[PDB]
Design a protein around this ligand. Structure first.
Ligand SMILES: [Cl-]
Ligand SMILES: [Zn+2]
Ligand SMILES: [Zn+2]
Length: 247
């Protein structure tokens, strides 16, 4: 493991610790875990949040939607722990400099955000009950209380057997488009955003019929090739969360 992989590993260990000692990862319990810090909600123009370690206070744009609010929180807690760990903080300072480290730390805040909001356990608990499916994703996203995109990467990172996740939305069965996408450990096939969803494809039917599905099908590679694999489409508020277990 290289520095960026060692740092991320560390940051996960950290989120893991802080979080571990929480009665859940709900926004309110994330707050209680704050070892005496002023958490203030207020309008921050076009800025989701900030963390002020001199005045020991996290600020979270109140304007924004609960989704990003909860995340911007998880994100700024993570930032606080990084500054807490003098090693991860130090090792970092001797490997990156200037904006280069700045980018690295806002990256490690996101790695940690996810570790906080989406416990390894939960992913596996769901990956066990529901397997690697478009519903394992629908459940983790609704259950950790984060976005399909936020839960798209977390779930694909615990999935062993080659699989390809993707969260979908309409163009306007009806015709939909790939928005986010995630490859399991094994997979090297890539399903990028903008890729469209044929009307005959299970997933379309799924979101159209506002009804879950699951059947052998194919990965509708934007390019043109229809690669077969077991799809599980889970529709909901106009998003079709879907899995593509490449055989
Ligand atoms: Cl930030
Ligand atoms: Zn920050
Ligand atoms: Zn940040």
């Amino acid at each position: 493991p290289t520095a960026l992989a060692a740092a991320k590993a560390r940051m996960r260990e950290l989120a893991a610790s802080y979080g571990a000692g929480l009665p859940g990862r709900d926004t309110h319990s994330l707050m209680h875990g704050l070892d005496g810090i002023t958490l203030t909600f207020m309008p921050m123009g076009q800025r989701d949040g900030a963390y002020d370690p001199e005045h020991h206070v996290i600020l979270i744009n109140s304007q924004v939607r609960p989704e990003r609010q909860r995340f911007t929180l998880a994100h700024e807690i993570s930032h606080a722990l990084l500054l807490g760990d003098d090693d991860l903080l130090s090792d970092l300072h001797d490997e990156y400099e200037g904006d280069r480290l700045e980018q690295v730390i806002e990256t490690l805040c996101n790695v940690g955000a996810a570790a906080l909001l989406m416990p390894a356990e939960l992913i596996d608990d769901l990956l066990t009950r529901f397997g690697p499916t478009g519903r394992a994703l629908a459940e983790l996203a609704r259950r950790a209380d984060v976005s399909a995109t936020s839960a798209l990467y977390a779930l694909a990172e615990r999935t062993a057997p080659p699989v390809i996740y993707a969260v979908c939305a309409l163009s306007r069965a009806k015709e939909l488009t790939v928005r986010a996408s995630s490859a399991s450990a094994g997979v090297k096939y890539s399903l990028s955003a903008g890729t469209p969803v044929p009307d005959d494809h299970p997933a379309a039917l799924a979101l159209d019929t506002r009804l879950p599905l699951a059947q052998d099908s194919y990965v509708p590679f934007r390019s043109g090739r229809r690669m077969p694999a077991y799809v599980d489409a889970f529709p909901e508020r106009q998003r079709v969360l879907v899995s593509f277990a490449l055989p």
